[PDB]
């Protein structure tokens, strides 16, 4: 019960300590002269502030929590400095979903958790402060302030002072953001243009990424309009327009085909709308690919549906039609029942030759009389058109869609799942295999003309470029955003000299697997026209155009070198506006200012602020950069990460030292096996896990979830096992320290010392080793579970009584390793061990030599002692056991040769039809034949548990003399009394024969 606040008493003191005393701070004027190996830096990607931290936010960064307090035990200076983020409409959009429900349900609110109210009411905020909040600066009040308390309950090894904000509210940061973009406009990194983004109509601006919560990676996506005339008779429906042209608007990814037009598909209960073009004429689309159009540029007042007619396609059907491309010199307008209202516009071509949706929902008007009755359809308009060969596929002919609708089957527009799979196989083969057939392109492959005949098209008037959102894109505000063509300003993602440059920093840097490299080596081929120009969102304003805010990804790239130099100018404030203690305005340092002290070779400039101040900081800058390490979610990989190195090679262009050198992508993070969602009750905050499992839990936890890629894994019931085994420990520790008269004292030398002491030397070493590999998981494995299982046989093999200066040992050298998953009880610990200093200030237990027959001979014992527990539950009293001193008959040339097939094989035997094979063939085992690959199948599984000798004819260390040593840990927790020792060719002959060494039998 109480198994927990205990920690938490002595885990906050530490942390009071641990600041007034200020141990992870570090400033290089200082630690400079006095390299003991280095300069390592870390980073977390700062968190948008609309929130505490949550638990997946810590697993992300513990990454590196447990990094620093690591390397600075093997001799490196750390400095992993915390900023926090609020450039974004994260802060904004959530602050504005609160305002409109005050307004719409005041208050106190009245609504008819899930709710923006009822989230922050769900931190416990009173009723009159939870409006402070509408103006989103009250956020930033108060919400940073809160993260930073948060993580001082963590324990986080950061110099605290090189905090911020991130928006215009602060005046440091706002000026180094300028000089980033005065640079990017002077190196060529930005342009003014018009382009195709990623649009929230309800945000007023362009939405990539991370303004977003649908899509996080959806992109500017293309098609093909296709424009249809309606035709007289009009339809009895379309009266009032006589004034204009009116177009039918329907749009195909394959321009390709439409020479296999036939008719028009509409599924009549679906709700269209047609408008006036600028143009003048009248298209017709769903109520949303018309809203898209219009921010596309289509409607005279751009992003405004001039609606003239609301309508369902049921009135429509039947309504002459011309079509482009097509002989069918009139085609009708048909109903295909199924017509999903995310894509296109409500309006699909036709190419029954060539899909086979198409050829489906045409075989059924044609095969039911009864279904041109419930909508009208005279025997003109669907009968007599027969699809037309337009492209010929190899394998299945001229007319691929009913070729092979004939031949999977196909009975309705409804046989799904198997009109998507005819789909498949045809759709793709159709697009190089193809090669067209009418005119104009007689015989020429698809991939070659795809483009061309569009061309055509819309130069000749019959078509013009619709594009859509790839999939549905709700915005932060909830908005269902829309691909737009807008002024913007951009990045130059995708220039040639730029991409082709920084591949070469993908290439340098180092990733941790190579899942990670392989998104980067996706994102870069992809990446091209990425705006950054918001009019909306907090943020830092664009200095040429200042009516343009920057958008949450790319203020956030180069800033970690911010993170160099704020403890300096920001004085460890939060927005930065307290006084500097280096006395500069936040005016007072200008794009000259920046530029010296962020490339080497920049001169001097005529500042106001004297030589003195300045070139501190780029001492501190040159001294940290360049950027050692990123440990994020796997989800900024290909946003901000992947522009974290475009900027960090275009700003600085040549100082390729200062690029990033390491970055290890994780998953996200699961409590208790489940999508941590704050909708299904399965949810944790730092500020709640933190008081429900000690810190020094909750981290002990987090090292031991994942360290793959692969989502982690956080179980409370593991988070609670930690809490157990840690105060298990201490009162261990406090059992030894009240019994220094029982640990045996001068020589360590019994068996199980040297066993134990070149066991706890191999281990600190494989901690060693899975530390630096940043693989939590196992530096936890090794380092406690397998720390504890040598302490724990120790105490038990060696009735012999522990050695005392063997016992401070292994205390010191556990307590060791646990400092970066544990710094609060280690450090309770290092005090109480006496040592005046603090853990921080530690070093790296080196491990003494390691005695590796004396490990390969203890696994003998702690072996077969777990073995003949097994024969024992059966039934005695007196006891008996049989060894051997070489291999008995049958299994000195099993053995002999067994190796046969590994000396001259170099990798492994032949499988097991060729085991009985040529043994069997033996003038000697003919007679065991039927046991000789029993004991050979079993011997091999510890070849890969036990290392590569067990075909040696010969052990390492003498097979008896070695449990001589420890009969008496037998004859206590096995509590018979005599056991003798025979070699066994004394023995009864049913053993003396078939047990060899490393296989002991027992009589009782
Ligand atoms: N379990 C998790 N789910 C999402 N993000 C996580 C998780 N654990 C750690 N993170 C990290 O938390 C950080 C929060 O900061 P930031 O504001 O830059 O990202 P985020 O916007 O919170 O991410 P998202 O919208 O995808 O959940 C991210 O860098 C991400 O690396
Ligand atoms: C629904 C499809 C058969 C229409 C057109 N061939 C397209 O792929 O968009």
Redesign the pocket.
């Given at each position: 019960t109480a198994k927990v606040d205990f920690l938490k008493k002595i885990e906050k003191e530490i942390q009071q300590k641990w600041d007034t005393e200020r141990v992870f701070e570090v400033n290089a004027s200082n630690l400079e002269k006095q390299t003991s190996k280095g300069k390592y830096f870390v980073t977390?990607?700062?968190?948008?502030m609309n929130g505490r931290?949550?638990?997946?936010?810590?697993?992300?960064?513990s990454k590196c929590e447990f990094a620093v307090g690591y390397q600075r035990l093997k001799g490196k200076c750390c400095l992993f400095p915390f900023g926090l983020?609020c450039t974004?409409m994260?802060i904004k959009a959530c602050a504005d979903k609160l305002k409109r429900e005050i307004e719409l349900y005041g208050c106190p609110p009245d609504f008819p958790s899930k709710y923006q109210w009822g989230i922050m009411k769900s931190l416990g905020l009173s009723d009159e402060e939870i409006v402070k909040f509408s103006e989103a600066e009250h956020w930033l009040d108060y919400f940073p302030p809160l993260a930073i308390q948060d993580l001082k309950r963590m324990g986080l090894k950061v110099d605290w002072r090189r905090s911020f904000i991130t928006t215009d509210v602060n005046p440091y940061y706002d000026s180094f953001v300028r000089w980033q973009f005065l640079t990017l406009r002077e190196r060529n990194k930005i342009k003014f243009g018009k382009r195709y983004t990623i649009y929230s109509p309800k945000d007023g601006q362009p939405c990539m990424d991370?303004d977003r919560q649908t899509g996080?990676g959806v992109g500017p996506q293309e098609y093909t309009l296709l424009k249809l005339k309606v035709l007289e008779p009009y339809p009895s429906k379309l009266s009032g327009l006589k004034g204009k042209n009116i177009f039918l608007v329907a749009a195909t990814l394959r321009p390709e085909t439409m020479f296999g037009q036939t008719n028009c598909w509409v599924r009549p209960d679906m709700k269209y709308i047609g408008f006036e073009t600028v143009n003048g004429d009248i298209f017709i689309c769903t109520q949303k690919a018309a809203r898209n159009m219009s921010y596309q540029g289509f409607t005279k007042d751009n992003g405004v549906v001039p609606v003239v007619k609301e309508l369902m396609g049921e009135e429509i059907l039947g309504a002459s039609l011309s079509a482009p491309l097509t002989s069918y010199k009139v085609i009708y307008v048909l109903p295909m029942l199924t017509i999903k209202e995310d894509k296109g516009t409500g309006v699909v071509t036709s190419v029954p030759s060539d899909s086979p949706d198409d050829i489906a929902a045409l075989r059924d008007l044609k095969k039911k009389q009864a279904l041109r009755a419930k909508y009208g359809i005279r025997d003109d308009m669907v009968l007599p058109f027969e699809p037309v060969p337009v492209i010929e596929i190899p394998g299945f002919g001229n007319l691929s869609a009913v070729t092979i609708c004939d031949e999977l089957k196909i009975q309705s527009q409804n046989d799904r799942e198997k009109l998507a799979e005819a789909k498949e196989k045809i759709y793709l083969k159709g697009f190089y295999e193809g090669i067209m057939l009418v005119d104009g392109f007689k015989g020429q492959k698809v991939q070659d003309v795809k483009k061309t005949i569009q061309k055509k098209m819309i130069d000749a008037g019959d078509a013009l470029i619709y594009m859509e959102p790839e999939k549905q894109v709700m915005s932060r505000s909830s908005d269902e955003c829309v691909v737009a063509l807008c002024d913007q300003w951009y990045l130059d993602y995708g220039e040639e000299n730029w991409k082709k440059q920084t591949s070469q920093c993908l290439k340098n840097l180092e990733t941790f697997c190579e899942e990670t490299r392989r998104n980067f080596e996706a994102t870069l081929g992809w990446l091209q026209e990425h705006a950054c120009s918001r009019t909306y969102g907090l943020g830092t304003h664009l200095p040429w155009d200042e009516q343009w805010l920057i958008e949450?990804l790319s203020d956030?790239t180069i800033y970690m070198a911010f993170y160099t130099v704020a403890h300096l100018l920001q004085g460890g404030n939060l927005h930065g506006q307290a006084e500097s203690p280096l006395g500069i305005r936040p005016q007072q340092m200008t794009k000259e200012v920046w530029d010296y002290v962020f490339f080497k070779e920049a001169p001097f400039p005529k500042t106001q602020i004297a030589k003195e101040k300045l070139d501190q900081l780029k001492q501190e800058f040159e001294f940290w950069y360049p950027v050692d390490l990123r440990?994020?979610?796997?989800?900024?990989v290909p946003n901000?990460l992947s522009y974290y190195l475009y900027n960090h090679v275009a700003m600085w262009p040549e100082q390729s030292d200062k690029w990033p050198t390491a970055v290890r992508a994780?998953?996200?993070?699961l409590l208790n096996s489940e999508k941590?969602s704050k909708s299904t009750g399965n949810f944790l905050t730092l500020t709640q896990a933190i008081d429900k499992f000690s810190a020094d839990g909750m981290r002990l936890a987090l090292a031991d979830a994942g360290d793959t890629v692969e989502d982690a894994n956080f179980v409370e019931a593991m988070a609670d096992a930690g809490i157990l085994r840690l105060y298990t420990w201490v009162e261990w520790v406090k059992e030894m320290v009240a019994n220094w008269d029982s640990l045996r004292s001068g020589p360590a030398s019994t068996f199980n010392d040297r066993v134990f002491a070149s066991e706890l030397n191999a281990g600190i070493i494989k901690t060693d080793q899975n530390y630096e590999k940043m693989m939590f998981k196992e530096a936890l494995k090794t380092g406690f579970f397998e720390f504890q299982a040598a302490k724990d046989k120790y105490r038990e093999l060696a009735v012999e009584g522990m050695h005392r200066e063997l016992v401070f040992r292994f205390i010191e050298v556990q307590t060791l390793l646990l400092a970066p998953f544990c710094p609060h009880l280690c450090e309770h610990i290092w005090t109480l061990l006496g040592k005046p200093d603090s853990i921080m200030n530690a070093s790296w237990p080196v491990a003494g030599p390691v005695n590796e027959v004396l490990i390969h001979s203890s696994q003998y014992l702690m072996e077969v002692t777990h073995d003949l527990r097994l024969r024992l539950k059966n039934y005695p009293s007196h006891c008996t056991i049989y060894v051997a001193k070489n291999y008995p008959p049958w299994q000195h040339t099993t053995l002999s040769v067994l190796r046969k097939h590994f000396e001259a094989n170099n990798g492994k035997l032949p499988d097991n039809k060729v085991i009985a094979s040529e043994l069997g063939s033996m003038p000697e085992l003919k007679k065991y034949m039927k046991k000789v690959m029993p004991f050979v199948a079993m011997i091999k599984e510890n070849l890969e548990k036990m290392g590569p000798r067990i075909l040696d004819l010969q052990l390492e260390f003498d097979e008896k003399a070695v449990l001589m040593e420890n009969i008496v840990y037998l004859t206590n927790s096995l509590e018979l009394e005599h056991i003798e020792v025979k070699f066994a060719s004394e023995a009864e002959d049913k053993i003396r024969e078939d047990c060899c060494p490393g296989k002991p039998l027992n009589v009782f």
């Open positions: 977390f990607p700062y968190p948008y931290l949550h638990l997946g936010h810590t697993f992300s960064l983020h974004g994260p991370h996080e949450s956030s440990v994020s979610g796997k989800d900024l901000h994780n998953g996200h993070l941590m």
